[PDB]
Amino acid sequence: MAQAFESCQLDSMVTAFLVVRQAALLSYADWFKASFGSTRGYHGCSKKALVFL
Amino acid sequence: DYLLCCIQHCLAWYKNTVIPEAFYEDLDDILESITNRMIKSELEDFELDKSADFSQSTSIGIKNNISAFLVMGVCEVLIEYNFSISSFSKNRFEDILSLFMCYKKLSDILNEKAGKAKTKMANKTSDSLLSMKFVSSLLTALFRDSIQSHQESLS
How many angstroms separate the most distant Cα atoms in chain B?
54
B47–chain A Cβ distance below 8 A for any pair: yes
Cα–Cα separations (whole angstroms), residue B70 to B1, B8, B82:
5, 16, 18
Report the chain A residue with the minimal C-alpha distance to residue B46: A46
In contact, B49 and B109? CB cutoff 8 Å: yes
Distance of CA B123 to the CA centre of its chain: 16
The CA distance from A28 to A33, in Å, is: 9
CA-based nearest residue to B7, from B28, B35, B37: B28
HSE, side-chain direction, 13 A CA sphere, residue B66: 6
CB atoms within 10 A of CB B91: 10
B96 CA to centre of own chain: 8
- What's the rounded Cα separation, in Å, for the pair B73 and B1? 4
On whether the CB atoms of residues A5 and A43 are closer than 8 A, the answer is yes
Compute CA distances B82 → B33, B52, B108, B129, whole Å: 12, 31, 24, 15
Asked if B47's CB is within 8 angstroms of A45's CB, the reply is yes
A4 vs A16, A39, B17, B145, CA distance in Å? Answer: 10, 12, 47, 54
Instruction: Specify the DSSP element, H or E, that contains B92.
Output: helix B90-116
Determine contact: A46 vs chain B, CB below 8 A. yes
Interface check for A47 against chain B (CB to CB < 8 A): the answer is yes
What technique solved it?
A: cryo-EM
| 3-class DSSP assignment, residue B124 | coil
The contacts found for B33-38 with CB under 8 angstroms, 24 or more apart, are B34/B78, B35/B78, B35/B81, B35/B82, B35/B95, B36/B95, B38/B74, B38/B75, B38/B78, B38/B99, B38/B102
Entry resolution (Å): 4.2
Closest CA to B142 of B91, B88, B94, B105: B88
Identity (one letter) of the amino acid at B55?
Answer: S
- B45 touching A (Cβ < 8 Å): yes
User: What is the distance between the alpha carbons of residues A32 and A2, in angstroms, rounded to a whole number?
Assistant: 14
